[PDB]
Amino acid sequence: YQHIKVPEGGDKITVNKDFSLNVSDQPIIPYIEGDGTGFDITPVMIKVVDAAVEKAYGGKKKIHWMEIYAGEKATKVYGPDVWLPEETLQVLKEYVVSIKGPLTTPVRSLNVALRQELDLYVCLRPIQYFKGVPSPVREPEKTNMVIFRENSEDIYAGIEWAAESEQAKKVIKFLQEEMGVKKIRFPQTSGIGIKPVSKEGTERLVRKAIQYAIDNDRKSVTLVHKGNIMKFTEGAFRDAGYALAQKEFGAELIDGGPWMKFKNPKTGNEIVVKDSIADAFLQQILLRPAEYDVIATLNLNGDYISDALAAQVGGIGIAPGANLSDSVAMFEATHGTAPKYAGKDYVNPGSEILSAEMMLRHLGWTEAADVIISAMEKSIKQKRVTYDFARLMEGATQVSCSGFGQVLIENME
Amino acid sequence: YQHIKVPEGGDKITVNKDFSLNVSDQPIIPYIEGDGTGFDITPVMIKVVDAAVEKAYGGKKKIHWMEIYAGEKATKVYGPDVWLPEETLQVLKEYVVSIKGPLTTPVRSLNVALRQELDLYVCLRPIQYFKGVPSPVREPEKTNMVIFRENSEDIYAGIEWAAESEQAKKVIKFLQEEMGVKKIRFPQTSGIGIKPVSKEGTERLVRKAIQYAIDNDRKSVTLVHKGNIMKFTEGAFRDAGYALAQKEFGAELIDGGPWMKFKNPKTGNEIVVKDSIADAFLQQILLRPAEYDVIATLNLNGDYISDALAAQVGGIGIAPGANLSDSVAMFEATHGTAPKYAGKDYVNPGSEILSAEMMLRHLGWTEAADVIISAMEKSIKQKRVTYDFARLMEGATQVSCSGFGQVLIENME
């Protein structure tokens, strides 16, 4: 490669024909530092993960970290305006499992570009409440959910044209004259965006959500959509999701529908497949959080829901996330780059750390992942935490970003 | 008219050239019963409003209610599939100020149809916390906001085609071949929706929001958008909103932008015009609710935000709303028709009652509106409330829908 150094003491992860992974005791894991606060967080994440791997496996296993480049640091290494090097994309695919810090874009989203170029069609966002975390809501412990957000289509496709541009004028002309569209209120000054939602995109996402409910013995899968206004996109997501539940999982209607249920083939438990209109859902996650579990939704809805839920559990700064295809997994910090805090060793490294926890569990290294959860639980209860938590607690000891890393490692004992 | 009886003892409201209203002591007010629970709520609203008007003005003023028809009741009066009679639309325009219960649609939204046909481009949703109301959040009293939701464009235009339909095939073909679109992930099975957002639609909505902040001495106007992914629609809303603030209200940048500020010409106070990305905004309304006041946003975002906020303050069942143009005002219950509760005198009439409170204030009858607020405040504190509140309170006296009407009227003394 041009600027990538492959660790010679490591082994490349390989994907079996059934999509299971071959992970050695010495796997290579590519990482992207991230813009801004990625500078502060990345070394702390690596140190914490290495410590957890050491604790769980007594030195037999070790991660061989391989730096690859995206965003500002990529432009510095590769040259002006090389924000996403071709070889970064190739390595992400070839080495299978990776982790990234936050990315920005100069004045389309590099984050979205990664998900789309690599066809990482699942955005996976677990929502859990850690005891002792200050929350804006009365009963945050009642929230335990897993969001499956569709990552490859919807209005996130980036298909749009600016008002009064020749391209926008042409599309509006087509819509008015060829399609007979009369519903554009102000055609003279309208920007136009396109929203594609497919049976194929819906089905692969919903399949993953339902299979996750089976594999992890979850109670329900809720299809979240705004299908009463967007009948042929959001409504179609709902329709195809229910159809797949019926066909592939043998779900049957509850009281003539629209909800369904089937028996978990691995545990025997009942799994309800239901649906919520997106606006109502934002109400019900607050009012009746215990009624929801696995969520399957579209790209835009998933964005809003994931953020609302992270806020609800007081976890804005520690929300983990993954972007998955059948054969590539990229784990990520879920917050912004926070440029005014960059280099100041101040922000919470918890998000990338818990995304690394997800990564370890994906590798089959569940023992090491459990070590991280234990450390996090203990550190929060001790109130030895970064400013973002400390400020909302009583009697807390405020620590630096790297300092929180040290607190976590201590709490692995 | 075919089936409308004009009260001969009433006077038609008229609109002056400056859009101010000429309202007599005996104005005619059209009302739509509403589907489902509209049967239960409507008579109670009328009784409560009449009592408030009596209390404030000692019999000098009286509303002359005029029933007009929409939804199921319209089909019964006018004939099969006449869901929105032409004369209903004509009367709503001609009589200026009206109130409606909830509407459904047979298996596009009659509610949306009304807003679009009458060009009621502002959806106005006040968000306030009533002392004593059970809320899911720790500090509901910190939420006091007014949502200006754009009502005439966005993905609510209803411009869409079903997957694999000849129309969808044609649009996708156009996009691929003529516009060079490559970003449709699954063109074979994609439904397509169109999202129009205009400078003209943005400007008239934002103008109303900023003028409201001036007239009511509010602290700030926040433009809420997802303009980092939808650059030419949601981003254009942001851009045009800021431009209008600068041009029409003399706003100037804070620290080189993007936020702005100007002096209220009526009170002298500073008004900040700022912006929030929609996903972040759903976090910040929970975490820092006191930082937000007047909100200006698009159709879809406004829908989600209005519902989330109503839930936050424990006001899902008492959230008032108005749909306004420069010359027509339609006040509405904001909940669904709840068919399994219809005819059972059980649901909360508070939403339509507080929408009527807004209606009275729009008529210039602020004294009568204040009577309703007083009654509502007192009734809630007494815990003499409908089941939806009673169940979440301790030591409450559960009353029927009509029973709550009586409690309110008692509390006008």
- DSSP state letters, A126-151: EE---TT---SBS-GGG--EEEEEE-
CA distances A123 to A46, A108, A249, A375, Å, are 23, 18, 22, 26
- The residue of chain A with its CA nearest to that of B109 is A229
Judging contacts by C-beta atoms under 8 Å, the chain B residues touching residue A201 are 185-186, 189-190
Which of B70, B86, B87, B66 minimizes the C-alpha distance to B13? B66
- The residue of chain A with its CA nearest to that of B190 is A198
Catalytic residue among B303, B307, B326, B370: B303
A393: left (phi over 0), alpha (psi -120 to 50) or beta: beta
- CA neighbours closer than 13 Å in the CB half-sphere of residue B50: 11
> Which of A160, A198, A283 is closest, CB to CB, to B189?
A198
Distance CA A399, CA B61 (A): 66
Distance CA A378, CA A275 (A): 37
Residue that has been written with the tokens 């920007």 in this structure: A191
Say whether the peptide bond before residue A196 is cis (omega within 30 degrees of 0): no
Tell me the longest C-alpha to C-alpha distance in chain A: 71
Helix (H, G, I), strand (E, B) or coil at A359: helix
Q: Is B239 a catalytic residue?
A: no
Q: Phi and psi dihedrals of A161, rounded to 5?
A: -135, 145
CA distances B291 to B192, B237, B272, B281, B307, Å, are 38, 21, 11, 11, 19
Catalytic residues of A: 156, 226, 279, 303
A340 annotated to bind ligand? yes
Amino acid identity of residue A372, one-letter, is I
Q: Is B303 a catalytic residue?
A: yes
Amino acid identity of residue B103, one-letter, is L
- The residue of chain A with its CA nearest to that of B172 is A196
Judging contacts by C-beta atoms under 8 Å, the chain B residues touching residue A112 are 229
Which segments of B84-222 does DSSP mark as H helices, in order?
A: 86-94, 110-117, 166-177, 199-215
Distance CA B330, CA B115 (A): 9
Which segments of B178-289 does DSSP mark as H helices, in order?
A: 199-215, 234-249, 278-287
Which of A63, A118, A82, A62 minimizes the C-alpha distance to A3? A82
Say whether the peptide bond before residue B80 is cis (omega within 30 degrees of 0): no
Distance CA B355, CA B361 (A): 10
Distance CA B182, CA A288 (A): 42
Distance CA B161, CA B171 (A): 9
State the smallest CA–CA distance between residue A370 and chain B in angstroms.
Answer: 29
> Which of B116, B192, B196 is closest, CB to CB, to A190?
B196
Technique that determined the structure: X-ray
Q: Which one of A194, A292, A334, A389 would you mutate to disrupt binding with B, by most B Cβ within 10 Å of its Cβ? A: A194
Residue that has been written with the tokens 């992970």 in this structure: A23
Amino acid identity of residue A96, one-letter, is V
Tokens describing residue A39? 């500078």
A341 annotated to bind ligand? yes
- The residue of chain B with its CA nearest to that of A107 is B228
B340 annotated to bind ligand? yes
**Contact by Cβ (8 Å): A319, A125:** yes
Q: Phi and psi dihedrals of A231, rounded to 5?
A: -65, -40
Q: Which helix H or strand E contains B152, and what residues bound it? A: none
> How many residues make up chain B in this entry?
413
**Contact by Cβ (8 Å): B244, B205:** no
Which of B275, B274, B329, B281 minimizes the C-alpha distance to B301? B281
Amino acid identity of residue B259, one-letter, is W
Judging contacts by C-beta atoms under 8 Å, the chain B residues touching residue A152 are 185
Residue that has been written with the tokens 């397509």 in this structure: B192
CA distances A97 to A30, A38, A127, A152, B358, Å, are 7, 19, 22, 19, 56
> Which of A139, A197, A312 is closest, CB to CB, to B191?
A197
Tokens describing residue A205? 């996402």
Tokens describing residue A135? 């929350």
A303 annotated to bind ligand? yes
Query: What is the Rg, in whole angstroms, of the alpha carbon atoms belonging to chain A?
Result: 22
PDB resolution in Å: 1.6
**Assigned fold of B1-413:** Isopropylmalate Dehydrogenase (3.40.718)
Distance CA B223, CA B297 (A): 6
> How many residues make up chain A in this entry?
413
The residues pairing with A27 across neighbouring beta strands, listed in sequence order, are A11
Judging contacts by C-beta atoms under 8 Å, the chain A residues touching residue B187 are 196
B125 annotated to bind ligand? yes
Distance CA A258, CA A78 (A): 54
